[PDB]
């Protein structure tokens, strides 16, 4: 059981980090970018922040702005057409998950043309050539698509999504620039922030957790717990910290499994289209409580970096302190306290529990959960038991 | 001031991790390896551990075993000749710093032939093509050459070393396998271990330190402090932990500066050819004491991961506890307590101090040191003041 880590070979961090793109492109000798993005980011002038710098530095670019939410086989083929017809030799992905995923597909098919039908990339793609180089510029503080080897494409003909898993698709450079993100409403910054915290905590305690993912996850938890209140209140430095925290959490959670929070949040998506972030946030502290005795010393670390002094406490008191710290953050940033507050129905719990039990990613949970354990966990998260 | 991180895109960790090489090569589609190594590793059967696996998996390889300590322009040209004449399309670097550095030079010149004279690579190499892909297998627990963008070549004609700095030279995969290292004497495991601890502590507190290098450095300190006693005593699991700790320390310290320990150890190399590791180890706690008031909360973290309970202490007591923990580890693993125990002469301190002051890397030290500060620090490290 050797451990593998896959990361972006190069990453730039800070407000104004996108400024590093022109010097990277020059040193890399690339002739011409295809910018892959959507109409919205062009219309709002976000793409122009990049093209203005490239024009000033004398760097050639073309654009494909046809990306839509749930990118399709058509969008991939369309983008690959513009790549081929524009004299481009590298990709700049400007946007959230959809542009990032569309770039991976375009870049893979360009160097692996036997996959031109796109649907043949599903599962562990048998590619033998790296993607065309991708320079990734995420514009949402909620995406880490640019540090994962996964991408999701919609097959319109067959009426389904398909997941592609391929180390060859990893972007060569990530630019993590809070200036390119700015402008979520407080409520979504809250859900997004605790969504990242959930991935970092689940990754910290997943069965396969090891030294390198532990190193990154505990830093992400420290950053997110330190910054999320300030970020929700619109603090500029807090926003920059949250961009870093989301990426660092991304580095860890892209390389190890998850557990029952993901397992239990995913069916709530399938049933009520509850925001993945809000469902995750509500469940997190209840699942942390469930898992506590199977986490060794790790909740001491979580308690410490969330600002609680626990070195004088016994291990179980320290574990209780970590759980209470997460309840406190959820309250402070306006997460609904219970699943019924976001429209979950008591009568669906047996069905939801079965879905969570059969979810592949539930196997990463450090404590074994039976159907009945998961039923009881939904109920504890569903309503207050103060009456 | 955006921060850059450069890392190996892929790394494999654990005893038997070199087993992952054959599946990596197959998925990457590469036709044929040039193995770059020295005669010693061939003679002792270390290279055969790799070629035996490649032969069983049906993977083609050639060998260049002409690497010597302080690799020369001649060794680079010789290796490039074998690369060209063997039908190789990728590199496997088997060995310590010398084979790793020779590979970077060969791989860069192969894809950047305008640098065929080798000496034209000195400084920030103006390469526009990535190196031929390098799969790095370090065989010494003391090297992190495979995660740095630096390499050093000896110019025999001009009677000098030259340093090449080039993001294009970064290996694509590192295999960190304690089985490929096994067999240092205790005394050198001790010097090597505290050498890694020194890089991690200096990197943790250097002026340019930031969230991602902090995340990796504090994990390396935890791993090394936890494992070094067991490793020196020949514990097998401790040896595996030390291989991981050295690499993780490598990830951090390759991306940020150092300080006065490096600044003061380097002239001791130039004057007495004192092992870089032993000089670093002796100086570390004295420099930590000097720096303490310019390190914020960080020595609390060092104290904690080295096994000291300091949450009840004031910050300055916690800082004293970190320093005492490092003195304790040095004693426990047999580091000489004072510089005069390794032949440093009192009369050389003014000259050594001047060299340290003018060393470029001394600028990373979080506390300003004048000539007189550095003179006094050498004296405090030079002899016991208990008599």
XYZ file of C-alpha atoms in Angstrom:
774
model
C 0.000 0.000 0.000
C 2.178 2.857 -1.399
C 0.481 6.317 -1.247
C 0.199 8.512 -4.401
C 0.000 12.339 -4.391
C -1.038 14.195 -7.619
C -0.744 18.027 -7.439
C -0.455 21.045 -9.790
C 3.288 21.232 -10.663
C 3.070 25.072 -10.304
C 0.594 27.268 -8.367
C 0.523 31.059 -7.767
C -1.357 32.564 -4.764
C -2.522 36.063 -3.722
C -4.530 39.080 -4.911
C -2.905 39.964 -8.288
C -1.507 36.377 -8.771
C -3.085 36.337 -12.303
C -0.329 38.957 -13.059
C 2.162 36.005 -12.949
C 0.462 34.457 -16.082
C 2.316 36.633 -18.693
C 5.812 35.797 -17.266
C 4.826 32.046 -17.036
C 3.663 31.993 -20.718
C 6.845 33.813 -21.897
C 9.199 31.413 -19.999
C 7.169 28.398 -21.342
C 7.577 29.634 -24.978
C 3.852 28.928 -25.810
C 2.699 30.575 -29.104
C -1.059 31.208 -28.488
C -3.763 30.589 -25.812
C -7.266 29.267 -26.303
C -9.231 30.890 -23.412
C -12.110 28.541 -22.397
C -14.893 30.324 -20.435
C -18.628 31.258 -20.571
C -20.488 34.333 -21.978
C -21.218 35.680 -18.431
C -17.496 36.101 -17.482
C -16.886 37.838 -20.892
C -19.957 40.151 -20.397
C -18.931 41.164 -16.778
C -15.357 42.028 -17.929
C -13.638 39.217 -15.881
C -12.032 37.640 -19.034
C -10.808 41.179 -20.045
C -8.734 41.360 -16.768
C -6.642 38.504 -18.348
C -6.735 39.506 -22.099
C -5.813 43.172 -21.167
C -2.610 41.852 -19.430
C -1.848 39.458 -22.374
C -2.365 42.297 -24.963
C 0.020 44.584 -22.932
C 2.643 41.730 -22.775
C 2.163 40.991 -26.540
C 0.794 37.403 -26.013
C -1.570 35.919 -28.672
C -4.988 34.504 -27.611
C -8.248 33.115 -29.055
C -11.525 32.584 -27.092
C -14.230 29.919 -26.809
C -17.015 31.290 -24.507
C -19.596 28.547 -25.301
C -19.244 26.726 -21.915
C -22.615 26.148 -20.147
C -23.388 24.576 -16.732
C -23.187 20.737 -17.196
C -20.828 20.936 -20.211
C -21.927 18.529 -23.023
C -20.118 16.454 -25.724
C -21.224 19.277 -28.140
C -19.482 22.032 -26.050
C -16.254 19.900 -25.920
C -16.255 19.292 -29.735
C -17.092 23.017 -30.329
C -14.166 24.134 -28.082
C -11.783 21.583 -29.704
C -12.832 23.042 -33.127
C -11.856 26.599 -31.989
C -8.559 25.220 -30.533
C -7.729 23.578 -33.915
C -8.825 26.586 -36.090
C -7.197 29.417 -34.002
C -3.512 28.264 -34.004
C -3.627 27.789 -30.172
C -1.004 25.503 -28.459
C -2.192 25.880 -24.784
C -5.396 26.413 -22.754
C -6.403 29.095 -20.208
C -9.466 27.880 -18.226
C -11.265 30.987 -16.831
C -14.287 30.088 -14.663
C -15.684 27.556 -12.173
C -16.086 23.765 -12.522
C -17.653 23.893 -16.037
C -14.822 25.774 -17.863
C -12.162 23.798 -15.869
C -13.784 20.438 -16.843
C -14.354 21.521 -20.516
C -10.598 22.424 -20.754
C -9.506 18.995 -19.431
C -11.702 17.293 -22.107
C -10.432 19.587 -24.955
C -6.757 19.277 -23.855
C -6.961 15.436 -23.519
C -8.687 14.890 -26.947
C -6.253 17.321 -28.716
C -3.219 15.137 -27.704
C -5.239 11.828 -27.651
C -7.335 12.076 -30.880
C -8.533 8.392 -30.675
C -11.031 9.803 -28.037
C -12.689 12.276 -30.529
C -16.245 10.938 -29.703
C -15.636 12.204 -26.065
C -17.905 9.482 -24.456
C -14.959 6.959 -24.807
C -13.101 8.928 -22.007
C -15.547 7.673 -19.261
C -13.885 5.959 -16.228
C -10.068 5.506 -16.097
C -9.337 7.018 -19.587
C -6.663 4.878 -21.382
C -4.769 8.023 -22.574
C -0.963 7.784 -23.105
C -0.340 11.531 -23.812
C -0.643 14.440 -21.346
C -3.377 17.056 -22.028
C -2.389 20.199 -23.960
C -0.995 22.367 -21.091
C -3.832 23.970 -19.004
C -3.274 27.254 -17.101
C -6.239 27.296 -14.642
C -7.795 30.567 -13.304
C -10.763 29.693 -11.036
C -13.301 32.585 -10.697
C -15.465 30.926 -7.948
C -14.124 30.498 -4.350
C -16.166 27.203 -4.314
C -14.181 25.239 -7.003
C -11.051 23.065 -6.690
C -11.733 21.436 -10.138
C -8.245 22.695 -11.260
C -6.354 20.415 -8.759
C -8.490 17.226 -9.344
C -7.863 14.631 -12.142
C -11.688 14.187 -12.481
C -14.050 15.890 -14.986
C -17.789 15.362 -15.748
C -19.320 15.684 -19.277
C -23.043 15.369 -20.229
C -23.895 12.840 -22.997
C -27.031 14.448 -24.603
C -27.582 11.459 -27.010
C -27.581 8.911 -24.082
C -29.201 11.378 -21.550
C -26.514 10.913 -18.812
C -23.403 12.443 -17.161
C -20.102 10.463 -17.330
C -17.071 10.842 -14.977
C -13.529 10.822 -16.512
C -10.537 10.058 -14.177
C -7.121 10.743 -15.775
C -3.796 11.959 -14.278
C -2.932 13.199 -17.864
C -5.625 15.980 -17.498
C -4.009 17.776 -14.449
C -3.447 21.511 -15.086
C 0.248 22.546 -15.197
C -0.374 25.907 -13.400
C -3.112 27.164 -11.028
C -3.501 30.951 -10.441
C -5.443 31.445 -7.153
C -6.327 35.177 -7.246
C -9.106 36.537 -4.962
C -9.473 39.558 -7.383
C -10.746 37.070 -10.082
C -13.412 35.707 -7.627
C -14.839 38.728 -5.611
C -18.684 38.899 -5.419
C -20.623 36.062 -3.698
C -23.530 37.004 -1.366
C -22.821 36.311 2.354
C -25.194 33.241 2.553
C -23.332 31.461 -0.343
C -19.839 32.422 1.014
C -21.031 30.722 4.282
C -22.245 27.487 2.536
C -19.115 27.444 0.266
C -16.752 28.026 3.254
C -18.277 25.275 5.445
C -18.443 23.026 2.297
C -14.601 23.372 2.056
C -14.276 22.841 5.865
C -16.364 19.600 5.492
C -14.096 18.226 2.682
C -10.974 19.109 4.791
C -12.363 17.489 8.028
C -13.677 14.348 6.190
C -10.297 14.070 4.357
C -8.409 14.561 7.673
C -10.176 11.510 9.275
C -10.911 9.247 6.195
C -9.611 5.614 6.470
C -6.825 6.258 3.868
C -5.553 9.524 5.517
C -1.699 9.781 5.681
C 1.063 12.315 6.523
C 0.904 14.539 3.363
C -2.935 14.824 3.109
C -2.981 15.354 6.949
C -0.426 18.238 6.553
C -2.619 20.066 3.950
C -6.086 19.307 5.470
C -5.160 20.649 8.970
C -3.752 23.859 7.331
C -7.018 24.263 5.278
C -9.116 23.810 8.501
C -6.946 26.457 10.286
C -7.279 28.905 7.323
C -11.066 28.406 6.805
C -11.954 28.499 10.574
C -9.763 31.662 10.907
C -11.220 33.532 7.862
C -14.863 32.396 7.246
C -16.573 34.898 9.674
C -14.526 37.821 8.204
C -15.230 36.580 4.623
C -19.047 36.319 5.239
C -18.895 39.936 6.611
C -17.079 40.994 3.360
C -13.516 41.475 4.736
C -11.056 41.681 1.752
C -8.091 39.888 3.467
C -10.525 37.162 4.733
C -11.653 36.664 1.070
C -7.961 36.146 0.022
C -7.458 33.651 2.931
C -10.657 31.740 1.853
C -9.330 31.393 -1.778
C -6.074 29.869 -0.359
C -8.013 27.642 2.120
C -10.319 26.251 -0.632
C -7.267 25.380 -2.834
C -5.229 23.817 0.032
C -8.339 21.752 1.034
C -8.544 20.815 -2.705
C -4.902 19.544 -2.665
C -5.691 17.133 0.212
C -9.253 15.968 -0.598
C -8.493 15.261 -4.346
C -5.936 12.598 -3.133
C -7.855 10.688 -0.355
C -11.446 9.537 0.305
C -14.278 11.150 2.303
C -16.947 9.630 4.611
C -20.534 9.820 5.881
C -20.995 13.633 5.415
C -20.532 13.249 1.597
C -22.403 9.879 1.732
C -25.455 11.510 3.467
C -25.369 14.959 1.701
C -25.359 13.389 -1.846
C -28.839 11.711 -1.561
C -30.261 15.061 -0.159
C -29.078 16.547 -3.515
C -30.840 13.732 -5.488
C -34.175 14.158 -3.517
C -34.555 17.940 -2.745
C -31.745 19.556 -4.846
C -30.456 20.933 -1.485
C -27.216 22.923 -2.044
C -24.337 20.354 -1.559
C -22.680 23.002 0.729
C -25.688 23.612 3.077
C -26.441 19.822 3.359
C -22.718 19.134 4.117
C -22.572 22.004 6.713
C -25.726 20.824 8.614
C -24.543 17.149 8.738
C -20.812 17.806 9.523
C -20.955 18.247 13.355
C -23.441 15.304 13.807
C -21.159 13.007 11.717
C -18.065 14.314 13.621
C -19.879 13.304 16.876
C -20.666 9.833 15.379
C -17.007 9.356 14.243
C -15.254 10.806 17.347
C -13.900 7.507 18.871
C -12.297 6.436 15.496
C -10.236 9.648 14.892
C -7.219 9.102 17.259
C -5.771 12.525 18.299
C -7.079 14.418 15.215
C -10.031 16.310 16.872
C -7.463 17.811 19.334
C -5.809 19.338 16.206
C -9.216 20.521 14.819
C -10.160 22.069 18.234
C -6.723 23.803 18.511
C -6.752 25.403 14.993
C -10.444 26.485 15.468
C -9.199 28.486 18.525
C -10.086 26.137 21.486
C -7.450 25.391 24.233
C -7.770 21.558 24.788
C -4.217 20.465 25.889
C -5.465 20.423 29.557
C -8.582 18.355 28.591
C -8.932 14.578 28.261
C -9.137 13.279 24.642
C -12.973 12.815 24.741
C -13.517 16.385 26.144
C -11.174 17.700 23.370
C -13.287 15.712 20.800
C -16.498 17.297 22.256
C -14.791 20.737 21.994
C -14.050 20.176 18.222
C -17.746 19.241 17.605
C -18.937 22.324 19.620
C -16.495 24.596 17.640
C -18.164 23.432 14.343
C -21.726 23.964 15.769
C -20.515 27.490 16.817
C -19.101 28.391 13.333
C -22.358 27.115 11.657
C -24.430 29.370 14.017
C -22.073 32.396 13.598
C -22.245 32.359 9.714
C -26.019 31.567 9.470
C -26.088 27.848 8.439
C -29.624 26.452 9.150
C -29.310 24.342 12.350
C -31.455 21.346 11.109
C -32.209 19.478 7.815
C -35.995 20.141 8.130
C -35.135 23.917 7.955
C -34.102 23.203 4.274
C -37.172 21.000 3.539
C -35.959 17.417 4.298
C -38.992 15.158 5.104
C -38.921 12.587 7.998
C -40.634 9.947 5.738
C -37.700 10.047 3.193
C -35.014 9.154 5.855
C -35.207 5.328 5.293
C -34.754 5.875 1.479
C -31.984 8.531 2.022
C -30.214 6.173 4.516
C -30.252 3.290 1.940
C -28.765 5.648 -0.757
C -26.000 6.828 1.714
C -25.184 3.173 2.687
C -24.771 2.202 -1.045
C -22.754 5.394 -1.932
C -19.163 4.168 -2.749
C -17.517 7.150 -0.910
C -19.304 6.218 2.422
C -16.684 3.378 2.719
C -14.008 6.043 3.594
C -15.848 6.857 6.905
C -13.526 5.839 9.809
C -16.501 4.346 11.794
C -18.660 1.558 10.251
C -22.275 2.748 9.706
C -25.146 0.217 9.275
C -28.495 1.264 7.697
C -29.894 1.857 11.255
C -26.846 4.010 12.323
C -27.422 6.229 9.207
C -31.232 6.408 9.872
C -30.499 7.620 13.476
C -27.862 10.152 12.209
C -30.428 11.679 9.743
C -32.967 11.997 12.650
C -30.361 13.673 14.971
C -29.585 16.205 12.131
C -33.287 16.510 11.102
C -34.792 18.342 14.152
C -33.908 19.841 17.560
C -34.523 17.341 20.407
C -34.754 20.220 22.969
C -38.611 19.706 22.901
C 3.926 39.765 -3.780
C 2.169 36.606 -5.121
C 3.631 33.315 -3.739
C 4.764 30.510 -6.124
C 4.826 26.781 -5.241
C 6.715 24.316 -7.541
C 6.256 20.602 -6.646
C 6.580 17.145 -8.277
C 3.261 16.654 -10.162
C 3.236 12.988 -8.946
C 4.951 11.336 -5.940
C 4.717 7.765 -4.553
C 5.569 6.996 -0.879
C 6.257 3.839 1.182
C 8.427 0.705 1.314
C 7.851 -0.930 -2.124
C 6.778 2.425 -3.752
C 9.334 1.763 -6.579
C 6.844 -1.046 -7.544
C 4.530 1.778 -8.810
C 7.134 2.678 -11.551
C 6.070 -0.063 -14.069
C 2.336 0.942 -13.957
C 3.332 4.686 -14.249
C 5.538 3.992 -17.342
C 2.792 1.860 -18.998
C 0.061 4.531 -18.442
C 2.496 7.256 -19.730
C 3.146 5.261 -22.972
C 6.971 5.895 -22.790
C 8.996 3.624 -25.163
C 12.379 3.259 -23.339
C 14.184 4.522 -20.176
C 17.716 5.823 -19.874
C 18.679 4.919 -16.253
C 21.202 7.523 -14.953
C 23.216 6.291 -11.920
C 26.791 5.472 -10.738
C 28.882 2.231 -10.841
C 28.481 1.694 -7.036
C 24.634 1.363 -7.168
C 25.007 -1.080 -10.154
C 27.716 -3.132 -8.288
C 25.628 -3.384 -5.009
C 22.531 -4.590 -6.958
C 20.374 -1.465 -6.161
C 19.830 -0.649 -9.909
C 18.847 -4.361 -10.460
C 15.888 -3.908 -7.988
C 14.454 -1.523 -10.688
C 15.625 -3.297 -13.938
C 14.348 -6.709 -12.565
C 10.818 -5.155 -12.180
C 11.044 -3.469 -15.656
C 12.214 -6.776 -17.308
C 9.259 -8.655 -15.640
C 6.804 -5.921 -16.880
C 8.404 -5.984 -20.400
C 9.672 -2.324 -20.267
C 12.766 -1.363 -22.355
C 15.760 0.356 -20.653
C 19.345 1.512 -21.324
C 21.907 2.556 -18.637
C 24.491 5.307 -18.136
C 26.419 4.549 -14.875
C 29.208 7.144 -15.431
C 27.926 9.631 -12.771
C 30.636 10.682 -10.247
C 30.411 12.970 -7.173
C 30.483 16.613 -8.481
C 29.121 15.701 -11.947
C 31.084 17.488 -14.750
C 30.228 18.881 -18.243
C 31.909 15.645 -19.562
C 29.535 13.343 -17.549
C 26.487 15.346 -18.840
C 27.641 15.128 -22.520
C 28.494 11.391 -22.032
C 24.997 10.683 -20.572
C 23.289 12.751 -23.333
C 25.260 10.632 -25.896
C 23.874 7.369 -24.370
C 20.340 8.918 -24.288
C 20.606 9.773 -28.032
C 22.200 6.409 -29.090
C 19.933 4.036 -27.028
C 16.455 5.041 -28.371
C 15.441 6.324 -24.871
C 12.505 8.835 -24.543
C 12.534 9.289 -20.688
C 14.971 9.305 -17.733
C 15.087 7.261 -14.493
C 17.461 8.970 -11.997
C 18.662 6.292 -9.503
C 20.931 7.730 -6.778
C 21.607 10.778 -4.584
C 22.218 14.419 -5.596
C 24.754 13.598 -8.375
C 22.533 11.279 -10.516
C 19.467 13.545 -9.871
C 21.415 16.673 -11.011
C 23.014 14.852 -14.030
C 19.472 13.796 -15.175
C 18.149 17.390 -14.998
C 21.095 18.555 -17.198
C 20.654 15.667 -19.739
C 16.831 16.083 -19.873
C 17.051 19.912 -20.317
C 19.735 19.772 -23.111
C 17.857 16.942 -24.964
C 14.733 19.191 -25.388
C 16.754 22.500 -25.443
C 19.706 21.638 -27.773
C 20.908 25.320 -28.010
C 22.462 24.585 -24.513
C 24.704 21.694 -25.813
C 27.896 23.293 -24.272
C 26.192 22.811 -20.798
C 27.968 25.886 -19.205
C 25.344 28.178 -20.944
C 22.675 26.791 -18.471
C 24.234 28.681 -15.456
C 21.803 30.946 -13.491
C 18.136 31.292 -14.599
C 18.426 29.048 -17.743
C 16.477 30.668 -20.664
C 14.922 27.281 -21.667
C 11.455 27.277 -23.343
C 10.947 23.446 -23.389
C 10.409 21.141 -20.384
C 13.134 18.531 -19.649
C 12.663 15.018 -21.072
C 10.409 13.465 -18.354
C 12.444 12.438 -15.228
C 11.239 9.618 -12.923
C 13.336 10.198 -9.744
C 14.316 7.339 -7.340
C 16.503 8.773 -4.533
C 18.730 6.104 -2.848
C 20.032 8.380 0.001
C 17.697 9.520 2.861
C 19.743 12.812 2.799
C 18.712 14.092 -0.712
C 15.703 16.179 -1.813
C 17.432 17.058 -5.167
C 14.396 15.476 -6.980
C 11.923 18.173 -5.699
C 14.239 21.232 -6.288
C 14.558 23.150 -9.631
C 18.323 23.637 -8.904
C 21.265 21.518 -10.172
C 25.077 21.994 -9.882
C 27.576 20.979 -12.644
C 31.422 21.205 -12.491
C 33.140 23.114 -15.352
C 36.557 21.304 -15.573
C 37.897 23.729 -18.285
C 37.109 26.840 -16.104
C 37.822 25.023 -12.740
C 34.460 25.972 -11.089
C 30.950 24.728 -10.151
C 27.915 26.517 -11.710
C 24.312 26.549 -10.340
C 21.387 26.125 -12.826
C 17.863 27.271 -11.704
C 15.056 26.150 -14.061
C 11.398 25.171 -13.396
C 11.599 23.169 -16.727
C 13.970 20.620 -14.994
C 11.462 19.462 -12.254
C 10.993 15.660 -12.219
C 7.466 14.505 -13.200
C 7.415 11.625 -10.627
C 9.282 10.993 -7.337
C 9.354 7.432 -5.869
C 10.215 7.714 -2.127
C 10.964 4.079 -1.156
C 12.893 3.327 2.085
C 13.863 -0.126 0.584
C 15.962 1.771 -2.080
C 17.821 3.712 0.707
C 18.484 1.237 3.651
C 22.091 1.238 5.009
C 23.523 4.439 6.583
C 25.573 4.110 9.818
C 23.814 5.555 12.922
C 26.120 8.674 13.159
C 25.262 9.734 9.531
C 21.494 8.970 9.961
C 21.715 11.365 12.995
C 23.500 14.191 11.042
C 21.188 13.648 7.990
C 18.027 13.639 10.192
C 18.921 16.841 12.100
C 20.089 18.372 8.740
C 16.482 17.858 7.448
C 15.058 19.177 10.784
C 17.267 22.330 10.367
C 15.983 23.000 6.785
C 12.348 22.484 8.008
C 12.765 24.801 11.089
C 14.668 27.520 9.099
C 11.996 27.290 6.330
C 9.193 27.455 8.960
C 10.503 30.834 10.327
C 12.194 32.411 7.197
C 10.991 35.976 6.293
C 9.084 34.701 3.180
C 7.273 31.821 5.032
C 3.538 31.478 4.094
C 0.569 29.093 4.596
C 1.587 26.254 2.177
C 5.317 26.047 3.141
C 4.202 26.349 6.842
C 1.787 23.365 6.328
C 4.594 21.096 4.946
C 7.475 22.275 7.229
C 5.508 21.680 10.498
C 4.546 18.150 9.237
C 8.259 17.425 8.384
C 9.318 18.622 11.910
C 6.630 16.346 13.490
C 7.748 13.336 11.352
C 11.533 13.837 11.889
C 11.257 14.578 15.681
C 8.963 11.489 16.013
C 11.197 9.061 14.010
C 14.894 10.159 14.277
C 15.722 8.289 17.578
C 14.111 5.054 16.224
C 15.887 5.527 12.836
C 19.355 6.038 14.487
C 18.684 2.793 16.489
C 17.882 1.008 13.149
C 14.057 0.715 13.473
C 12.590 -0.202 10.009
C 9.310 1.816 10.342
C 11.346 4.828 11.664
C 13.526 4.571 8.483
C 10.332 4.733 6.301
C 9.069 7.772 8.328
C 12.505 9.514 7.869
C 12.329 9.036 4.020
C 8.849 10.720 4.049
C 10.036 13.486 6.458
C 13.100 14.334 4.286
C 10.871 14.616 1.144
C 8.126 16.685 2.873
C 10.863 19.017 4.290
C 12.200 19.142 0.672
C 8.755 20.273 -0.644
C 8.732 23.266 1.755
C 12.410 24.347 1.813
C 12.822 24.215 -2.053
C 10.108 26.990 -2.251
C 11.177 29.510 0.499
C 14.445 30.892 1.935
C 16.500 29.835 4.980
C 18.412 31.898 7.597
C 21.451 32.101 9.886
C 21.905 28.292 10.401
C 22.610 27.840 6.628
C 24.466 31.221 6.592
C 26.809 30.097 9.460
C 27.139 26.351 8.526
C 28.235 27.128 4.887
C 31.526 28.942 5.829
C 32.357 26.015 8.270
C 32.176 23.811 5.111
C 34.536 26.197 3.199
C 37.118 26.311 6.115
C 37.128 22.794 7.752
C 35.019 20.676 5.305
C 32.745 20.006 8.344
C 29.753 17.837 7.284
C 26.946 20.354 6.333
C 24.598 18.201 8.535
C 26.751 18.204 11.744
C 27.510 21.990 11.423
C 23.754 22.701 10.875
C 22.750 20.446 13.860
C 25.233 22.107 16.315
C 24.188 25.683 15.297
C 20.373 25.086 15.059
C 19.356 25.476 18.761
C 21.690 28.528 19.295
C 20.209 30.251 16.182
C 16.648 29.278 17.314
C 17.445 31.017 20.667
C 18.755 34.114 18.769
C 15.616 34.218 16.523
C 12.974 33.405 19.200
C 11.337 36.907 19.514
C 10.845 37.182 15.667
C 8.953 33.849 15.177
C 5.388 34.787 16.367
C 3.585 31.619 17.633
C 5.687 29.157 15.555
C 7.951 27.758 18.377
C 4.719 26.732 20.225
C 4.020 24.521 17.148
C 7.644 23.182 17.120
C 7.480 22.429 20.909
C 4.061 20.682 20.515
C 5.082 18.371 17.589
C 8.428 17.537 19.358
C 6.266 16.193 22.261
C 6.309 19.146 24.780
C 3.003 20.373 26.395
C 3.268 24.245 26.191
C -0.414 25.430 25.927
C -0.312 26.293 29.703
C 3.018 28.208 29.290
C 3.573 31.839 28.283
C 4.887 32.343 24.698
C 8.534 32.943 25.831
C 8.519 29.774 28.059
C 7.065 27.822 25.061
C 9.909 29.285 22.873
C 12.489 28.153 25.520
C 10.825 24.682 25.501
C 11.258 24.402 21.651
C 14.998 25.305 21.976
C 15.435 22.763 24.861
C 13.619 20.042 22.777
C 16.229 20.532 19.956
C 19.187 20.432 22.455
C 17.605 17.172 23.821
C 17.261 15.505 20.349
C 20.909 16.501 19.486
C 22.111 14.869 22.778
C 19.887 11.748 22.332
C 21.207 10.962 18.761
C 24.907 11.808 19.486
C 25.401 15.222 17.755
C 28.610 16.853 19.170
C 27.428 19.584 21.606
C 29.942 22.316 20.451
C 31.701 23.464 17.211
C 35.199 23.007 18.771
C 34.306 19.254 19.156
C 34.438 19.134 15.271
C 37.658 21.230 15.030
C 36.392 24.850 14.613
C 39.121 27.327 15.784
C 38.278 30.451 17.909
C 40.670 32.604 15.753
C 38.623 31.868 12.533
C 35.299 33.219 14.023
C 35.775 36.843 12.743
C 36.458 35.481 9.174
C 33.567 32.912 9.422
C 31.213 35.688 10.716
C 32.110 37.956 7.715
C 31.415 35.031 5.265
C 28.003 34.314 6.994
C 27.055 38.064 6.880
C 27.802 38.204 3.076
C 26.037 34.832 2.331
C 22.893 35.738 0.242
C 20.677 33.163 2.100
C 21.424 34.841 5.534
C 18.928 37.592 4.427
C 16.027 35.088 5.014
C 16.773 35.059 8.816
C 13.727 36.594 10.612
C 16.025 38.572 13.026
C 18.635 41.038 11.637
C 22.208 39.877 12.458
C 25.158 42.351 12.371
C 28.789 41.103 12.120
C 29.048 41.327 15.974
C 25.751 39.352 16.521
C 27.154 36.541 14.264
C 30.586 36.633 16.054
C 28.776 36.192 19.448
C 26.553 33.364 18.024
C 29.685 31.431 16.816
C 31.233 31.823 20.344
C 28.002 30.595 22.087
C 28.022 27.493 19.752
C 31.850 27.096 19.959
C 32.320 26.007 23.635
C 30.415 25.239 26.864
C 30.238 28.307 29.165
C 29.602 26.048 32.231
C 33.320 26.662 33.204
